[PDB]
């Protein structure tokens, strides 16, 4: 499992592992405690699996970002250094490892992007200077700049300069709704990049197999890259150097900062052994120096050893950039943002789209509710006794996208498209692929209660269920089985949710699923608000025959179901929608026109939270 | 002024004053302290004038309602009885004398409305019984009921029964916005009253000169009236009695409860002398009994003497009604409500309007922003060197209505209608008629600054003013004159409000007046929000040439000026108006249609807060 009185560390093969191994030796020497350092193939992939298991390493070495997910999962321990130790490192590095306002790793090294010696004797202080400068090198049958364009990481620092960002860092928390891809900053920066392409200075087709393949063959004078390039510009022996990034609009170009970190497994019994090894054997000028010798670690988190490294201009440069630039977010919403801005630039620079066009889309696509994309190739293992149709599996993919992105929703497919089976599919895939085995609540009408059991018994026999129904004395018989929580699903009706509330409200239901049935019935809000009062249900799903209704009362109750907390005190849609106009004590109901545009806006709002397919487009 | 070591009490001539005088004798007997009891003509009118002066009586005797205004003005002292004394009286009576959650009088007597002995041997338990019963007395060439209809006090108890009220009593405070004249309760009650008129049982023309003139001549069997009638039904010696009010829809008919009270002048030096006389000489079974002998006081607040009075069915009846019925509100908004419901009934019952029609209007007219009506016949005394035109004086009447009803507003009359003079008129009438002499703030543009001084110097020379302007060293010279507060008005410009804020924000400005000038300029909200941040100004007035603009930005800033507090955190109109739709993290600006109806609603909202007359309709 996870061996006591010893230390097993995972660090990638690209890093100076054999150097780290030596630091482990001095530990075992002065302490006797064995230290094993391994570089497992695709270790960052293997780590979460084995961590939930209670296996794996005691110490993990990867960038502070990938640690966010591990921290969300709780696979990393809250590191406890005293104040004095925190002063030994830069405060900005401790930020990179702070999750939910708790330190979850030890910051180690720092990497960023940075800016020839002969050809370019003096470097351009402002970005604005580069056209004049290019005319000179173009007159020499060459160019002044040729970095990677086709990728967004390299092209983002000027977009970031004037005030263009990804997620607005709140209190101690990023906001995935406050996205800065459409502000003047981003537009000034991206317009300028397209300015160089249209003025023939820079080519739009410019990728990495050119970014490096030209600056190394003496074709260009300047380039924007990181430490992984330095070693290949040494091979071609071109007289090079690195420096700070230019001030576009009298503002510094902000690149993304990667902080190599050491995290301790929440499963590892040797937590004080790891704090002792890290705080006293690794996070020391001597300890860091030891690793740096096998493969350099660029800038370091440690103030003391950083000054000694700042002797080299190259390291003092990346570190200067770092404090002025910005740290990579640990939040999963990054995959959307990068995909958004990747395409934004390709288009804007190719001519296919206007700067204001590409950035308009990129900003929307990244702030999108279904940001976390997750492919579902095949059904659950627990999902047997039949193979789902193409769309039913597609239905599960949107429902797991609902789960991953922590959103509630509606499956409004036409009756007889297998919504029942589709729910069953979500519940199984949420056990066989995620560790969500917790109490599922399923509210079905009497008339289909029995069919719901029937289909579970067929397709997912593994899923054990309580079927909350019967005489008062029969319902009582079930009372213990709940307290046990040996069940995955409970099935019951609208009647028992309200009547036997004093027993069913008591459970912390992981997922709540309501099946409206066949009957096209208009629902009142008074009831949903009452369900809301007593029931803890983070993830909600609604299954309905009917599509989105064009009636405010129904839409009002739909929102109270979909967003339970938000409308706590406010009981009516009238109170809610008059509110921006209510501040004069005037009490007037909405009119016909006012109402039409409210319904209009509500349909556009609920738009990404509903899924509906029709028999006529399927078969 | 207000003589020490003595007591002067005011009670009306209609009450048992010579009986109260005797209670004063026993005080002087056992204490030596002289007690003088006077019944001044229109004493409730004379009291506020003389109380603000620091003159008048030490003790005042009137109903708990008229004491609300005296309490708002602070002409009555916070009475301090210990817990034990409060138990001697009913808790519902102590409510009647609680203003701003402070006891401000001593409850004394209780009066209400109540319900023949022979003709009607058994009284009708339910209101619903009266048609069947009327058929009997109509078969005897008479009628079963003939009370006052033309008045609203008498007709309100059934309107009140099912749930029809005037002002929703909050925490310990009435809500003049939460008015219950349009609910099902009021409609069930008022429909029933019209049911009797259309079925020829009751006549719509029925007034007091019939309500009494018929029941006393043996014409009718039942009537709804109060204690002031009892004495005249004794003269005609008709075998009568009083009882509880019927249950319409299985609910008791709620009438209005008048609580005769004893208030102590906040000016009176003899505050402990009055508490001693009241708590120990008047509010005793023996003390109350003494007054009751000159002229009866119906039900009493005192538990102990009330049981002894409950021997008479008549008193135990009014007291039963009282606890089930409701107490008269002390708030000034009553004049609107009564005028609203007075006409509502006249119409509904005459046929001129439908129940749903009259009550629709009555509910609106009573919840109206300009509820407190106050006539202004002639201008101020301090307003000389010219006589105002008809509309300019009308302008002052709407501006004092703005003041009385504690509302901000706009005077958007066409340039050259004498808005300047009209402001001057409000400022003077607010000194000569109200004691508002406090610091007035007036913001005028540079170009008219000098004309503003000029017109004051002409019309209101009495009004002394600081004219905040000049070089830094000249502005400094004024610094003391402000700290003094020997001035009524300060005149200054937009420039000095922001620049010399660190000096002008420090004053608690009673009224703030902004004169937009002539220039049709579009105003930004960023500035009004900044003015709002640092300035204390309860009453605001805006003077402008231009009428209400059809642009959301301008309307947004207008609301921040008009309602300063309300939009504290919310900076934009976009954030504010998307808010009921914002709860999904979606950030989308309003469209063309959405915007049109917002402007629409805002114009209807601001409608009662703007005054505009045009040259073309005046001359
Ligand atoms: N489909 C559709 C399209 N468009 C519109 Cl506008 C409305 C639509 N339907 C809809 O909103 N359904 C809703 S809303 N609240 C509920 C609920 C509930 C509930 C569940 C269990 C117990 C209790 C208390 O007894 C209440 C339902 Br079910
Ligand atoms: N007339 C009219 C009709 N319709 C619409 Cl939509 C808008 C209209 N005008 C209007 O709203 N005026 C407003 S709004 N806020 C202000 C203000 C102010 C202010 C005063 C002193 C100092 C500072 C800070 O320097 C600011 C004014 Br003045």
From Swiss-Prot, chains A, B:
It holds the Pfam family SBP_bac_1. One of its GO terms (biological process) is maltodextrin transmembrane transport. PROSITE patterns: SBP_BACTERIAL_1 (PS01037). Gene3D superfamilies: Periplasmic binding protein-like II (3.40.190.10). CDD domains: PBP2_MBP. Its main location: periplasm. Keywords: Periplasm, Signal, Sugar transport, Transport. InterPro entries: Maltose/Cyclodextrin-bd, SBP, SBP_1_CS. GO terms for molecular function: carbohydrate transmembrane transporter activity; maltose binding. The keyword Transferase does not apply. GO terms for cellular component: ATP-binding cassette (ABC) transporter complex, substrate-binding subunit-containing; outer membrane-bounded periplasmic space. Part of the ABC transporter complex MalEFGK involved in maltose/maltodextrin import. Binds maltose and higher maltodextrins. Belongs to the bacterial solute-binding protein 1 family. The complex is composed of two ATP-binding proteins (MalK), two transmembrane proteins (MalG and MalF) and a solute-binding protein (MalE). This is Maltose/maltodextrin-binding periplasmic protein. The gene is malE.
